[model samples]
Target: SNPPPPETSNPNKPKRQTNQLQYLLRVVLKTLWKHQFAWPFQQPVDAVKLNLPDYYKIIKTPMDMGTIKKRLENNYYWNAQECIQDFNTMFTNCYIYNKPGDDIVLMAEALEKLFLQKINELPTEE
Candidate 1:
């Protein structure tokens, strides 16, 4: 369930396509955390292949050294609030939600809706 729509647009105003990718990225990372997908280990072969296609195709599971190096370099402090802190730690020059807001929950909901839509699109077996 999404929040109420933004106020009606003024006739003279038109929005640009820029910032769309950033918005999507923000939501995707939050979704990943919401799903509780493990980090630094576990590959797509371990889960549903469609779940994380990129992992099966491109990114490999990071080793413990890589994980530790990342945490130390980023000064990351892992915690229960995955989206609030973990999201920021994983990315550079990006801060999704630094303060209190319902944006995170809305993003997570959007992610779930998209995931279900894709799941339905998959072909059924005989």
Candidate 2:
């Protein structure tokens, strides 16, 4: 076990890792938001506005970069895994809603791979 400290104690150890993880989350978020294939993922899909009636019926829990950005402001991501899962949800929803050969579906596949690649590059303590 690590020795306790007077000022920054052992309890702060977890917090240090939290800061680093948050940084990685933020960077990955910005990259995904600005990615070329991220157009469909940057904002929530509107069923009526987009004239896609079956969208909501198909995707129960919708996820998007804009929603994720708001969640980040509220400190919704407790860990990197949660953040990764949200992106996965967004991509998986696309796969469920669109045909496999659809352009948007392909874009979703591309962006998810990029997101996974970027997040995996982050340094972790455990």
Candidate 3:
């Protein structure tokens, strides 16, 4: 049996990857908003009724008091800080098999170049 080919380079599969990146960016943006601007930043009652759309919607605008209370009022194990930390930690796991000092710099540099290339290749949406 052969291992599956990586999907990162597939043009047809870009939507799936793009969706994931969009979600990540949304979370990071929302976390910044909630921390910086939202008054309460976690509404426990709303959290009880939380859905994925609600989460994403909050990401798009300055959250209202109700929405703020819901997410931060967490009964869930994760919070904004934890979410950010875990998201960053996942990247560290990508380098786990490689030796430190050597592998990390190389990986980081390659990722930077990849991002630059991606930005250079983007078409204007507007």
Candidate 4:
């Protein structure tokens, strides 16, 4: 007989700003997808099909724009940091597997900086 009445709304969840951040992240992905150096980073690497025998072994956690895009849209990344970290991981993996002078390495580096610049430009206050 002492149970609390049901509430009309649950204010415990801060969804508005969280969604705002996701929207911005989607835009960032859109921008990155259009970059001149984005081709190699757009899809997950086909290690076996591409004939890289030990790529999966060397890069334990491979990341890519396609995976991030899917995860972001599906709300798998609940926080901005978690989402951004995927991007970092993608580039970091590339750096680990590819040589410094490789074209894909340069592409990954370019995208990493662009992503950082975009996030820095993102409005964190308001």
Candidate 5:
């Protein structure tokens, strides 16, 4: 028997694909918020928590928070474009391989664009 098509290949499936994309995006965004901004920017805990849903758990099993934090700390002047590029690199190199057949590739790119826009809009503390 032939193998089945990929799970997200069906266009008419339920909103599961969309939901999963959002979940992954949120996880990335919240992680960046937590580690990249918190201590370096003196961000309040309440502020960080406000960005994520209560159901969203921040797990760093696949992510090395220490290395990321140190890198970001050492290079604090990255532009929004650079940050977006880094996010894409992180997802591609780190997380995408773990999820074999999810349909979040384009969604992930789009979210990174939106995220970069917002990051550019934020007022600089300096």
Candidate 6:
């Protein structure tokens, strides 16, 4: 069954993290719309989990606002292209492309990959 397209905006919630994710996804959709519907290339962006093991334990859904803030604080600032591309890959390309069980693992793996890439991009403050 073909899923209906999503609305560009929502009004039932005031959560900033949700808004951020929605806006980012919209940006990706717009970027893809102009490029023969292909995903763009992006550097890296990361999300860090302060709760460590507990953070990794949740596999039913995406992370929440607190964790989202931690990720924003810790992540690298990817270029416009990198940001769009990676978000496309993690949310659209990989997670959405898999079965439920695989989606969870893929989401975690995709997120970790971005984090690892961001960590690699960090410059040492000498």
Question: Which one is best on TM-score?
Answer: 4
Distance from true position, residue 114, model 2, in Å?
A: 0.8
Which residue pairs collide in model 1, if any? none
Which segments of candidate 6 are over 4 A away from where they belong?
Answer: 1-65, 68-101
TM-score of each: 0.21, 0.77, 0.22, 0.78, 0.29, 0.25
Superposition TM-score, candidate 5 onto the true structure: 0.29
Greater TM-score among 4 and 6 belongs to 4
lDDT of 3 by residue, 13-115 (tens): 2122233233333444244344432322222213324332343333322223233223233222132333334333333433442355665436434443443
Q: Mind giving the per-residue lDDT tens digits that candidate 4 earns over 24-93?
A: 5567788898999888777778765678877877887777887777666555544677667788888899
Q: CA lDDT of each candidate?
A: 0.31, 0.70, 0.33, 0.71, 0.37, 0.35
Cα lDDT tens digits for candidate 2, 31-122: 77788888777778866777888777777777888777755555654576766777788888888888888999888877777777887777
Q: What is the lDDT of residue 37 in candidate 2?
A: 83
TM-score of candidate 4 versus the correct structure, residues matched by position: 0.78
Candidate order, TM-score descending = 4, 2, 5, 6, 3, 1
Give candidate 6's error at residue 31 in angstroms. 16
User: Of models 5 and 6, which has the larger lDDT?
Assistant: 5
Sequence-dependent TM-score of model 1: 0.21
Stretches > 4 Å off in candidate 5? 1-65, 76-78, 100-126
For every model shown, the clashing-pair count is 0, 0, 9, 0, 0, 2
List runs of model 2 lying over 4 Å from the truth: 1-17
Cα lDDT of model 6 by residue, 37-72, tens digit: 222212111224222343223332332222222333
Model 5, 1-126: lDDT tens digits are 122211222334322223223322345445445542333222211324444232113322222223333334444323434334445554454334335444434444444455566555544333
Q: Per-residue CA lDDT of candidate 1, range 12-98, in tens?
A: 443332232233233433334345432422111222433543332332221222332333234332221322233233221112222
Clash list (residue pairs), candidate 4: none
Where does the lowest 10-residue lDDT sum fall in candidate 5?
Answer: 1-10
What's model 4's lDDT at 52? 82
